Amino acid sequence: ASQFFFNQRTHLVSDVIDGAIIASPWNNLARLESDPAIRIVVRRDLNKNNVAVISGGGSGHEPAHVGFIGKGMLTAAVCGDVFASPSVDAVLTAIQAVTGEAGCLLIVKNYTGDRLNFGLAAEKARRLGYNVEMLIVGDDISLPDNKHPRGIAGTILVHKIAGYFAERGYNLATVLREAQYAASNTFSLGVALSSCHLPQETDAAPRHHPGHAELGMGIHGEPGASVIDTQNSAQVVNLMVDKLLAALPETGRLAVMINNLGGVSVAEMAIITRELASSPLHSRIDWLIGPASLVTALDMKGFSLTAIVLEESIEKALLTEVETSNWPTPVPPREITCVVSSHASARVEFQPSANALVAGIVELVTATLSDLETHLNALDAKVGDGDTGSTFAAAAREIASLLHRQQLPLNNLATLFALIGERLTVVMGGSSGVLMSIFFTAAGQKLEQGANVVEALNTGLAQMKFYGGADEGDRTMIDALQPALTSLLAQPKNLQAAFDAAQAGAERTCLSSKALGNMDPGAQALAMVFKALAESE
Amino acid sequence: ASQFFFNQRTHLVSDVIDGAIIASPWNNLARLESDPAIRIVVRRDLNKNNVAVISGGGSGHEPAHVGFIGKGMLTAAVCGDVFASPSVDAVLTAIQAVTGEAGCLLIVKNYTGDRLNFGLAAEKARRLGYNVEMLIVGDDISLPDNKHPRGIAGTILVHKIAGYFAERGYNLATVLREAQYAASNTFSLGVALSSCHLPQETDAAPRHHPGHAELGMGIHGEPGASVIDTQNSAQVVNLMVDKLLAALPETGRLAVMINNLGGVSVAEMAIITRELASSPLHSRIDWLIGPASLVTALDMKGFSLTAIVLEESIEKALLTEVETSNWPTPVPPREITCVVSSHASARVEFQPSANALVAGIVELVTATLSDLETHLNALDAKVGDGDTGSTFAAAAREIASLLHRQQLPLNNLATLFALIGERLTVVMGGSSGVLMSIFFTAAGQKLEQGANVVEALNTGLAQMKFYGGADEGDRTMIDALQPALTSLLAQPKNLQAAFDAAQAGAERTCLSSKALGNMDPGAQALAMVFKALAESE
Ligand SMILES: Nc1ncnc2c1ncn2[C@@H]1O[C@H](COP(=O)(O)OP(=O)(O)NP(=O)(O)O)[C@@H](O)[C@H]1O
Ligand SMILES: Nc1ncnc2c1ncn2[C@@H]1O[C@H](COP(=O)(O)OP(=O)(O)NP(=O)(O)O)[C@@H](O)[C@H]1O
Ligand SMILES: O=C(CO)CO
Ligand SMILES: O=C(CO)CO
Ligand SMILES: [Mg+2]
Ligand SMILES: [Mg+2]
Ligand SMILES: [Mg+2]
Ligand SMILES: [Mg+2]
């Protein structure tokens, strides 16, 4: 057991190169022909004139590094198995394959493996006349007590710079110089809630600290430095900023790169951006690079923060656009702005009126429902959350009240409907309330545009179905309403006819239980209403 | 206990809007002033003239939908809490705030919540004169037995189209029409290894099926349809393709969108792309949209596949560039190509020679090490993996052999070194081998460029330090080599002097254990070598 989408373990690395290629925005990536145990990617527009910038490292960091290959950055990338440096054979095959006479600059992440392998390589290469140069990058500041700073997220910035001068046609020695400069002005710090899943069956889940967060967890999954007693975005980001400010000049503009280690939600990544924005670090940030997954660790739920000082040339090269696959384009921290609108109140206006007829109905209808409360709750109990009767009564009691306080526009229906619509949702929560609002609301806009009572009701229904998604036969109040309304559309004055129609429909809902004790509360509610009307006309 | 980067639970949604804004590439996003319980984002370049396309839904799907706001797509986006539709109050405030006279088209994801809320809204809006229109999107094909297809990943394509016609200045009724057209030509299917983590303490971990994968897992984390008996990339992707082909025309070009639900590694996402590339679906794909996180479910470890038929207008509108935050730019499935190089073999050339002197050393040195094997293994056992003696002997026995078979270029050192360098890594695996290769290899390139034996050795060392990262005092063989080499650089012929130097250094490594039983194998190995040399001169 594990949790990894992959086919043939042994074709893992390869398959990733393929898919990386099959998605090249600039179709500028190409695999270098060679033994299967050597996985190299090289830019199709090879310019052996300029100094070639080669980079690499293990897999699982993705897009690093095939991602940053092409005009403006990496010439080629050497990929080894998951979390393991390539062979010497491969780093060499790469130098030869793409290095011209201007030379090549190997940019290696600070780890004894990559160093040793890329190193022996660079040597066997020097010996073949190739002018080689190697720059070890160590930007992690998470373990100051350790001799060799781990190389992480910041590495790619070192590329951006090196690549700049490379394309401009500068001498190898000038590339290296400018490359190291950036490096020594780069500081990265990472945090993670839980490690990453691997492409193999393992003992137990990934390292994890319940409720806590590990600071400085290595991209290979290495153990970090400390453990923060919380998972709180603000707190955690601030702490990181301190440790970051603690190792950055007391003054100097800078660009900050927010890296997603692979398993943080886009949402979370966003909060973290808001956190760093309100960070004591804000007042010196002229640029943001992220949120984005730039140098990940498989699906590790962690993010990183990389700061780079803008002294001299650095900034110029950052901002220069390039032709890579995943390189993000620096963006100055925008300022949240509040746009305003001429927002007209919806609160329906009305002027109280009396109307012996309509009032008699509003009274009868409202009252009818109000008594059922208990029984409808009973029915809703064998079916759902036993809240129907109470829910429906709230809406009734409310309009019933407004009736008695003489505050109802009885003389104008299109307005009375619109009013009821705009009030039920309040007294009654839940879908019902909204559905019962959609009904009248849509109804009143049919009456308004000059239509009879039955045509509005029927349309108020059509809308209730459109949004509510319910048809006849779904064991719903629609099962009694429609029939009832379809009967009034024929014989507009025959209330017995419409009553019977509802009662029949209300009964169908009784013939498909999975819990007359299986009856759908809505249907009943409806039917008993039309029954009330009929026993008075 | 949980696993979520967030500060104030109640400011969750808001905070995400902020960070989404603070990163706007086009600085075209702005929050609409309103009560705090109403979270709306609207494009700054509001053009009431064109029909406004409003969309929304819960949070946690991220960049959807604030990410797709701007020229060419969404006018505004209404955001509700995590995995919960916005209020009616909010969907309305949005329509008013940005809808002109040309009207507005609400594009809603198929879920009873969003429908009901955005619906009552659209109604209360119609009533205020606003020409409103609502399009429910349902592209999930994972549960054909269900009445209402869930809305997912494909939704954004529906936007791309609707937005197209909107900006061109078309009539509301033309937008809707073209919008629905795309929708009905969109088919999505998702898979997940495990659900997502939420911003709250919960009973147990997210749904998960050890070794298996859930098909049709809802973006809210709903239960999917089936469960595949494997996690295999190829298998899983193929199955999805079948079910996809099963619901797509037997003929027709199409674009496919590969969506990352939030928690899949970039690497995995890439394999899945390679899988779909070799899929029975390839021969009809003129475009790829992804891999990318477009409509996620927090950190859910799953991906989705959305197919859209290119009949008529659809394709024209897809490809049109827009001014959004996260909209990807369709890219035709590239073809992996193999670039070739003029790769010169490194295999060092040499012509056998005899040399009484040098051979006497190669013999003495090689032999000296060869005997230690046992003792060096003992020392390496109290310190590391008890493999030193054996490792070092392999390298010795090997050169010792080559000595005896008269196959060594004894007459030319620069070549003998270069040869030994190019052979030790083979007989001896592990860092030692590589270090011992870096030594001689770099050495031979110093002798080659005309230098004495001691200057090469000293340089071979300098390199070993540069790549190996070890300095004097790190309890390493460097602790005996350097002193020894530093002694020969002064008195080049005094072997006793150099011996003593090593023996002293070898002894320092003895004064900092954490396991003369604490001695570093490397150091000893070295010292006993210079001792051998001295007891013969
Ligand atoms: N399209 C529809 N979808 C769902 N329910 C409907 C629909 N049309 C009518 N109903 C009725 O809605 C009633 C539900 O009762 P109600 O008093 O709202 O409690 P509830 O809906 O079960 N809980 P809640 O989701 O919080 O509103 C049922 O009796 C159904 O008859
Ligand atoms: N960076 C370094 N530079 C120089 N010498 C080193 C360095 N690291 C280790 N050594 C020496 O190399 C010896 C390593 O012994 P060895 O028998 O190769 O076991 P090992 O280090 O565990 N090989 P491996 O299993 O690949 O890690 C030690 O005695 C050290 O003296
Ligand atoms: O993945 C790690 C292996 O060394 C860094 O490349
Ligand atoms: O998050 C979901 C809420 O219904 C989809 O918008
Ligand atoms: Mg109920
Ligand atoms: Mg309820
Ligand atoms: Mg050992
Ligand atoms: Mg070993």
Q: Which residues contact B40 (CB under 8 A, 6 or more apart)?
A: B31, B32, B34, B76, B77, B78, B79, B90, B93, B94, B97
Q: Which residue, among A471, A503, A465, A466, has the nearest Cα to A487 in the 3D structure? A: A503
**Which residue matches tokens 């990183």?**
A304
Interface of A with B in 76-105 (CB under 8 A): 88, 92-93, 96-98
With beta carbons less than 8 A apart as the criterion, state whether B530 and B499 touch: yes
Q: In chain A, positions 277-316, which contact chain B (CB-CB < 8 Å)?
A: 277, 288, 290-291, 293, 296, 298-299, 301, 303
Q: Which of B432, B472, B510 to mutate to test the pocket of ligand 2 (most atoms within 8 A of CB)?
A: B432
Q: How many Å is the maximal CA-CA distance in chain A?
A: 109
Distance CA A434, CA B534 (A): 98
Is B349 exposed, middle or buried, given 0-12, 13-18 or 19+ CB atoms closer than 10 A?
exposed
The one-character DSSP state at A206 is P
B460: nearest Cα among B478, B485, B480, B440: B440
The shares of helix, strand and coil residues in chain A, as percent rounded to the nearest 5, are 45, 15, 40
* Contact call for residues B13 and B60 (beta carbons, < 8 A): no
Residues in chain A: 537
**Residue type for position A436:** M
Resolution in A: 3.1
CA distance A121 to A119: 5
Summarize chain B as % helix, strand, coil (round to 5): 45, 15, 40
CA B482 to chain centre: 41
Tokens of A62: 């993705």
The preferred substitution site among B377, B476, B482, B513 for testing ligand 2, maximizing ligand atoms within 8 Å of CB, is B476
Q: How far away, in angstroms, is B273 Cα from ligand 4 center?
A: 27
Instruction: Tell me the two tokens of residue A261.
Output: 């280690």
Per DSSP, the residues of B187-211 read EEEEEEEE----SS--SSPPPB-TT
Report the DSSP beta bridge partners of residue A31: A41, B338
> Does the beta-carbon distance from A193 to B92 stay under 8 Å?
no
Q: Is A91 helix (H, G, I), strand (E, B) or coil?
A: helix
- DSSP β-bridge partners for residue B258: B305
Tokens coding B283: 């021969």
Instruction: Fill in the amino acid letter for A177.
Output: R
CB of B50 closer than 8 Å to CB of B166:
yes
B 427-456 residues with CB below 8 A of A? 431, 434-435, 437-438, 441-442, 444-445, 448
Give the ligand 4 atom nearest the CA of B61. 1
Distance, in Å, from the CA atom of A16 to the CA atom of A360, rounded to the nearest integer, reads 74
**A–B: how many Cβ contacts below 8 A?**
360
Query: What distance in Å separates the CA atoms of residue A373 and residue A371, rounded to the nearest whole number?
Result: 6
Nearest 5°: CA angle at B43, between B120 and A337?
A: 105
Strands B186-194 and B213-215: antiparallel
φ and ψ at residue A378, rounded to 5 degrees: -60, -50
Give ligand 4 pocket residues (Cβ under 6 A): B 57-58, 61, 83-85, 109, 111, 113-114, 220
- Report the distance separating Cα B40 and Cα B34, nearest Å: 8
B435 CB-contact burial (10 Å; exposed 0-12 / middle 13-18 / buried 19+): buried
The C-alpha atoms of residue B41 and residue A137 are separated, in whole angstroms, by 41
Interface list for B 451-480 with A (CB within 8 A)? 463, 466-469, 474
Give the separation between CA B462 and CA B63, rounded to whole angstroms: 52
List residues forming the annotated binding site of A: 58-61, 109, 114, 385-388, 431-432, 468, 476-477, 520-522
Q: One-letter amino acid identity for A494?
A: N
- Residues contacting residue B71 through CB under 8 Å, at least 6 positions apart: B28, B43, B45, B167, B322, B323
- Measured from the Cα of A520, ligand 1's closest atom is 29
Q: Which domains, and CATH codes, for chain B?
A: 8-333 (no CATH), 351-537 (1.25.40.340)
Alpha carbon distance A98, A78 (integer Å): 12
Residue B522: name the closest of B376, B407, B418 by CA: B376
Nearest CA among A172, A55, A50, A35 for reference residue A106: A55
| CA contacts within 13 A on the Cβ side of B243 | 24
Q: Which residues contact B467 (CB under 8 A, 6 or more apart)?
A: A115, A116, A119, A120, A134, B435, B438
Choose among B266, B341, B421: nearest Cβ to A296.
B266
Residue B308 CA to residue A374 CA, distance in Å, equals: 51
What Cα–Cα distance (Å) separates residue A525 from each residue in A390, A529, B153, B419? 12, 6, 39, 96
Closest CA to B456 of B432, B424, B489: B489
Could you give the angle at the alpha carbon of B321 between the alpha carbons of B316 and B323, nearest 5°? Answer: 140
Of A2, A96, A123, the CB nearest to B341: A96
Strands B29-32 and A338-339: parallel
Q: Which of A120, A258, A276, A289 to mutate to test the interface with B (most CBs of B within 10 A)?
A: A120
Indicate the residue of A32, A445, A448 with minimum beta-carbon distance to B339.
A32
- Dihedral sign for Cα B227, B229, B231, B236, please: negative
Annotated binding site of A for ATP: 385-388, 431-432, 468, 476-477, 520-522
- Round to whole Å and give the CA distance between B16 and B60: 9
**CB-count burial class (<10 Å; 0-12, 13-18, 19+) for A79:** buried
Burial class (CB in 10 A: 0-12, 13-18, 19+), B372: buried
Please tell me if residue A330 touches chain B, with a CB cutoff of 8 Å.
no
Q: What is the CA radius of gyration of chain A?
A: 35
**Measured CA angle at B109 (ends B97, B44), to 5 deg:** 30
3 state SS of A52:
strand
Q: How many Å lie between the centroid of ligand 5 and the Cα of residue A380?
A: 5
CB B181 within 8 A of CB B314: yes
User: Residue B114, exposed/middle/buried by CB under 10 A (0-12, 13-18, 19+)?
Assistant: buried
Burial profile A313-347: b = 16 or more Cβ within 10 angstroms, e = fewer: ebbebbeeebbbbbbbebbebbebeebebeeeebe
Cβ pair A116:B25 closer than 8 A: no
**B30 phi-psi bin (left φ>0, alpha ψ -120 to 50, beta other):** beta
Cis peptide before B291 (omega within 30 of 0): yes
* Active-site position among B220, B343, B375, B404: B220
- Put simply, the answer to whether A272 touches B5 (Cβ < 8 Å) is yes
d(CA B376, CA A200): 35
Chain breaks in chain B (C to N over 2.5 A) after: 515
Closest of A297, A98, A342, A316 to residue A191, by C-alpha: A297
- Go through B290-323 and write b for each residue having 16 or more CB atoms within 10 A of its CB, e for each that does not: bbbbbbbbbbbbbbbbbbbbbeeebbebbeeebb
How many A from CA of A422 to the centre of ligand 4?
25
Measured from the alpha carbon of residue B521, the closest ligand is 2
The atom of ligand 3 lying closest to the CA of A59 is: 1
The β-bridge relationship of strands B29-32 and A39-43 is unpaired
Q: What is the CA radius of gyration of chain B?
A: 35
- CA distances from residue A312 to A181, A246, A253 in whole angstroms, order as listed: 10, 22, 11
Which residue among A6, A291, A333 places its CB closest to the CB of B268? A6
Contacts of B187 (CB under 8 A, 6+ apart): B139, B141, B154, B244, B247, B248, B306, B307, B308
